Write a protein that binds this ligand. Structure first.
Ligand SMILES: CCCCCCCCCCCCCCCCCCCCCCCCC(=O)OC[C@@H](O)COC(=O)CCCCCCCCCCCCCCCCC
Ligand SMILES: CCCCCCCCCCCCCCCCCCCCCCCCC(=O)OC[C@@H](O)COC(=O)CCCCCCCCCCCCCCCCC
Ligand SMILES: CCCCCCCCCCCCCCCCCCCCCCCCC(=O)OC[C@@H](O)COC(=O)CCCCCCCCCCCCCCCCC
Ligand SMILES: CC(=O)N[C@@H]1[C@@H](O)[C@H](O)[C@@H](CO)O[C@H]1O
Ligand SMILES: CC(=O)N[C@@H]1[C@@H](O)[C@H](O)[C@@H](CO)O[C@H]1O
Ligand SMILES: *[C@@H]1O[C@H](CO)[C@@H](O)[C@H](O)[C@H]1NC(C)=O
Ligand SMILES: *C(=O)CCCCCCC
Ligand SMILES: *C(=O)CCCCCCC
Ligand SMILES: [Ca+2]
Ligand SMILES: [Ca+2]
Ligand SMILES: [Ca+2]
Lengths: 269, 269, 269
């Protein structure tokens, strides 16, 4: 169980994550409205949300997404797209652990995700902080589904501590680093990380523990099935580093469960 | 077992479905020969078959194929290509059920398949009906492998009942809609649906029943193995909505079985 | 166990194979250095290795790779990229056996691999033999990982016997032909084939024996695990056509093992 307020935020940023997949939302002119196709992001359309920055084929690994200004909810939203291109999938396969001493000592992160973020950090950091200067009353939120959630998590860890809080909402995100990084993500201040999983989705189980990967805490686990609407009672908070009993169970994983986080996600053309 | 006459049709249109994958057959000039690479479609090449309309990157979902005029067999063949592009695959994943009451009452169909067809139906109907007018003694046949088989099925159900029969030959096609639609496809008049499957091919088992999908009846189940020539005694007719004992068995599915329908299907460059 | 000299050769050409995946190494000016990204080919970078010819999207099947001049080791290295593009994967799925009598009598090879090589054989033979004339004391070596190893295996069998030795180092290569071709690859004069496999990598088990495919002898089998450094004591030579007890064992296969051949291979962007 989560509060209705937190449920509304989980639902909203799942739609911001879904919107990042739509092709027209990766080269949109600044100041234009954020829209999706196939009812992918109704709540985002209802809001007075526009593009501050729209990017695709950026850095290494085909970083893609947009930076949004939400005047209704008073948000600065950085939404990363998940895997769609061949270049995205190849970056996922770069799963050896690389030192990220510039984030925390003893921490190691997925080579692919960390390399991709490093390659766009300077540009996007400047875009976000320009927005905070213009709208200092707003709230900064990084979000993304799958690979996009892994990027939103790494980015949040790297840019926190510079005067503005950064909340992160990831959906079906894979493990991003070793246990040192997982513990750091669990105790870091300057914003909250909401790591949302769904039933037996396979992606949050990758890369496997045996390669040295761990999950941060807590986990918000959606128990309602695929194609089933989600209510605030279907989400379970699960505390503990590499906690079992949520998505991390010793049962058969599922691929279609990876595409149902409050609605269909990853399928917007 | 099936008759030799039906076996000959099953083999012929399996090769028309293969020709649709060949890139050269998706942007060819009208009136030119239909040819394939290797021995992908020797029976089509032997016929006096020419392009009426060759299309690619059409509508939504990257609809690809050709409309052919076969003077040897007296056919008007609309052949849809199966999955190859990333865009084809994103469309396959839009597996929510959408209303198609214009086709039949209470029927619901795969969102992607029905949205792809709807985006090209006006253009293709006109070309099919132009050919029927000029060649009223020719037989209209929609066909396709995998996704293409799903598009042929939908297009056939949508255009039937306008004066001319439309027969559909689908190979390794997934489920396309709900039970209402599966029953409509079973009893619809004005043409016959030949839904063909091969051993334990995985694709006719998608999307899973649990998501609300059913299969029309009957099923023509190829029992011979992969890379094994098919004889008319290897094909078994299986009647009953969502019938088991054919491809729909609770065993381990197979991927290479998806590519062997009389010959190799889906591999023409 | 293998000798430290052979181990060093196995390690060097694993990095030449890894280099072929980097996009910048498929369209580089002749004479420029060969480099990779993130420690993918450190030994290649240390060497005085420059491009003689880089190719991409060549022939049929998206043949990709480079021809390198290594002055440090006195090598002419032809490195084929493995699977990355959709076109690559379609070619892999063309797995029926085709006559390659011009290479060896009674031999039959994978249709995709042999068609891909035939479509570039005249261009690449000219490039290799030009380099031989220019540096007649250098050693010619074909190498590749996965699909690249299969192309390197077929190319060496075709181009041997024209006045110079061709050594082949394949990593995680699939079976390329029938038994006759497997025997020929075992005994052919004018160079050596080092076929290297890793633990229970699935790819060297494809296509299955039951489709008529056989593996040449010997097999150099890496017993250390994924993400585990390799030492010369972890490699075991296994002789015999279609020998078991190495990679060819009736146990569960593994996909990540395919990417670890002394290091991460297939992941360079
Ligand atoms: C459009 C997307 C369509 C949905 C399909 C989702 C595919 C999920 C798989 C990649 C997700 C990308 C993604 O974001 O993360 C995947 C990546 O982190 C995993 O990298 C790997 O280690 C390889 C995984 C390959 C899948 C094989 C399954 C088992 C792997 C472990 C084997 C055990 C080790 C023993 C040796
Ligand atoms: C993993 C091997 C690769 C397969 C392909 C995956 C990535 C494809 C992207 C590019 C592909 C290029 C074109 C290649 C064409 C031939 C290759 C495609 C082969 C797969 C085709 C899929 C259907 C096509 C297709 O038309 O898609 C059907 C569409 O309705 C999607 O349906 C879904 O709901 C998505 C399901 C995704 C996979 C679900 C996993 C299977 C579930 C069962 C698990 C298996 C365990 C069973 C054992 C139980 C017994 C104990
Ligand atoms: C993608 C772009 C970059 C490559 C990254 C992915 C590479 C992964 C390699 C492994 C994939 C398999 C084929 C690749 C070989 C390369 C390659 O070079 O292909 C070799 C070729 O000879 C294979 O030809 C075949 O016979 C096709 C076999 C298809 C097998 C697909 C297996 C993938 C996963 C499916 C699991 C089994 C099905 C469910 C079982 C359920 C049991 C209950
Ligand atoms: C370019 C080409 O091959 N055109 C052919 C022609 O050679 C052949 O006589 C005829 C028979 O169908 O079909 C067309
Ligand atoms: C970096 C560059 O442009 N060229 C280098 C050159 O500086 C170096 O002396 C030589 C030694 O291998 O390799 C090449
Ligand atoms: C976008 O929405 C805002 C109001 O929220 C306003 O600029 C206008 O109605 C919309 N503009 C376009 C081009 O749709
Ligand atoms: C992230 O790598 C997961 C891929 C997103 C799924 C897109 C729709 C299948
Ligand atoms: C149906 O979705 C088509 C799947 C076959 C892929 C083409 C053959 C490589
Ligand atoms: Ca709006
Ligand atoms: Ca002809
Ligand atoms: Ca160098």
């Amino acid at each position: 169980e989560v509060s209705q307020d937190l449920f509304n935020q989980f639902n909203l940023f799942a739609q911001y994550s879904a919107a990042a997949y739509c092709g027209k939302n990766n080269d949109a002119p600044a100041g234009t409205n954020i829209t999706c196709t196939g009812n992918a992001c109704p709540e985002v359309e209802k809001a007075d949300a526009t593009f501050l920055y729209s990017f695709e084929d950026s850095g290494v690994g085909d970083v893609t997404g947009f930076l949004a200004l939400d005047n209704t909810n008073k948000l600065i939203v950085l939404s990363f797209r998940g895997s769609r291109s061949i270049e995205n999938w190849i970056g996922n396969l770069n799963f050896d652990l690389k030192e990220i001493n510039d984030i925390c000592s003893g921490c190691r992160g997925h080579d692919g995700f960390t390399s991709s973020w490093r390659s766009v950090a300077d540009t996007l950091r400047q875009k976000v902080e320009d927005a905070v200067r213009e709208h200092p009353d707003y709230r900064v939120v990084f979000t993304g589904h799958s690979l996009g959630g892994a990027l939103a998590t790494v980015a949040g860890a790297d840019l926190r501590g510079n005067g503005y809080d950064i909340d992160v909402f990831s959906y079906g995100a894979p493990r991003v680093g070793n246990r040192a990084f997982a513990e750091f993500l669990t105790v870091q201040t300057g914003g909250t990380l909401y790591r949302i999983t769904h039933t037996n989705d396979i992606v949050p189980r990758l890369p496997p523990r045996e390669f040295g990967y761990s999950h941060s805490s807590p986990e918000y686990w959606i128990k309602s099935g695929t194609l089933v609407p989600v209510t605030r009672n279907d989400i379970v908070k699960i505390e503990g580093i590499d906690a079992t009993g949520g998505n991390n169970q010793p049962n058969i994983p599922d691929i279609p469960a990876h595409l149902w986080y409050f609605g269909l996600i990853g399928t917007c053309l």
